[PDB]
């Protein structure tokens, strides 16, 4: 029935997302392991992830549906293995750009993971099994983040061994990706709804918030490494990341439980949470104390999770199961276009080339402007 294609997929989602080395990425790269500078990391290497992901989004989206999901999941496993092999052994900036490209391929393939269950599970086990597949990956994420800090601070393991552990995790994640059943059907090819205007409003807010959050998460660790360099101070990235994820999870559940007529309160809550995210980013920027920087991050992630859960609820409440894939694909594509434009303008060496110390001022202003744009038409 719906068990085997759900246990296998959830084990894949768990082991793939349990990567203890992700929290300490910047401390690993800029340390004696790789000798990369902060300026290079922030202005030549990291921007490549946005570009490769943007380029590979749509082709992967079409390929998944034509090829019926599993082979794309297998490709994602292979990309995990290659990315972490390069991250372990690859050296220099020229290889880190390739690493970023392969990680962009990894992220783009996430479509063929979440959508696979729909093609092989009945429709009376769709509603719930979606929750299992989300929760398993989220729990894996938090567990990996907690394990990273536990090991680093109570065992004294260098950041290289965290990457070794992450590679060992993704290798086993790939193994469970060969065992799924091949779907006998698919959504569109083996089987314009935006005409609704309110869906367009919710999609715009979803896309803008996702772009801003994806940029901030991409360039947060560099801020922590500049305010408290790992070379001579205690760094608490794993625990902060775990607590931020747990706060986001509690926020997502709380929004799901509390019953409120979102047709009236959705815009107000979205504005309030955008203002909270702007203020928290400004606090995370200006303050020299590191602990205030962690607290600002935590507040940012929790508020963003509340905002995004409200936005997702409003969009998906009227759409069929079939339209979900296409609608969210277009919404993430617009998000990536926006993210690429802003990355090129701000961070890229072919643009302003701002350092991490001033980037977050721009990001805070961006979130404040997102909040303020929707509030107009107040007299007359």
């Amino acid at each position: 029935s719906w068990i085997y294609p759900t246990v296998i997929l959830c084990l894949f989602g768990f082991f793939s997302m349990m990567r203890p080395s992700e929290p300490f990425l910047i401390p690993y790269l800029s340390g004696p392991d790789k000798n990369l500078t902060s300026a290079e990391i922030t202005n030549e290497i990291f921007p490549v992830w946005t570009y490769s992901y943007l380029v590979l989004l749509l082709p992967v989206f079409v390929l998944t549906d034509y090829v019926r999901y599993k082979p794309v999941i297998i490709l994602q496993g292979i990309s995990f293995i290659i990315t972490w092999l390069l991250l372990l052994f690859g050296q220099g900036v020229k290889t880190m750009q390739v690493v970023e490209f392969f990680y962009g391929m990894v992220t783009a393939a996430e479509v063929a993971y979440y959508a696979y269950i729909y093609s092989v599970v009945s429709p009376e086990h769709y509603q719930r099994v979606s929750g299992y597949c989300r929760s398993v990956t989220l729990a894996a994420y938090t567990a990996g983040s907690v394990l990273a800090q536990l090991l680093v601070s109570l065992a004294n393991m260098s950041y290289f061994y965290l990457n070794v552990i992450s590679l060992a995790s993704v290798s086993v994640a790939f193994l469970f990706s060969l065992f799924l059943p091949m779907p006998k059907k698919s959504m569109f090819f083996h089987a314009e709804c935006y005409s609704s205007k309110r869906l367009f409003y919710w999609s715009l807010w979803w896309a803008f918030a996702t772009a801003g959050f994806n940029q901030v998460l991409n360039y947060v660790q560099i801020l922590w490494d500049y305010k408290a360099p790992s070379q001579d101070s205690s760094i608490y990235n794993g625990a902060v990341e775990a607590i931020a994820t747990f706060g986001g999870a509690v926020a997502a559940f709380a929004v799901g439980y509390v019953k409120v007529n979102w047709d009236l309160l959705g815009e107000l809550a979205l504005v309030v949470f955008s203002v909270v995210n702007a203020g928290s980013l400004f606090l995370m920027h200006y303050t020299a104390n590191i602990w205030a920087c962690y607290a600002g991050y935590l507040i940012f992630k929790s508020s963003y999770m509340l905002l995004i859960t409200i936005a997702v609820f409003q969009i998906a409440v009227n759409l069929n199961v079939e339209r979900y894939a296409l609608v969210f694909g277009i919404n993430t594509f617009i998000a990536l276009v926006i993210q690429t434009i802003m990355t090129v303008i701000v961070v890229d060496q072919r643009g302003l080339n701002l350092p991490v110390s001033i980037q977050f001022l721009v990001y805070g202003s961006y979130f404040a402007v997102i909040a303020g744009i929707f509030l107009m038409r107040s007299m007359y």
Partner: nanobody
Amino acid sequence: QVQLVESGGGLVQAGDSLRLSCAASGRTFSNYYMAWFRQAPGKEREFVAAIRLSYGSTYYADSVRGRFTISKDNAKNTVNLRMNSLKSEDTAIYYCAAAEDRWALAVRTATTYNYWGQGTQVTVSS
């Protein structure tokens, strides 16, 4: 015109260390890049390192990353390049060049820099 002056290059024993210095002059340098390029006989001009004097950002070429280290002596304007563990491949002539910090600057492109110094050999003999 902005006058640049390298100083501190010469013979050095293979595997041992040396420090080059580019005593820039003739203008204010609070908004300037300052990068070192080299030209071994028979090869093209190569990028070696760069420093953004405003934010202090530093870039390095993968052939020297970890071995060389570039720092600014602000009180004197004399940018320095410290070469540690020079290897036989480091024989070259080293130039220090500068460019006004502006939008869309390609740090690693030798055609970006408006001002060049007369150079000074670093004969890394073995």
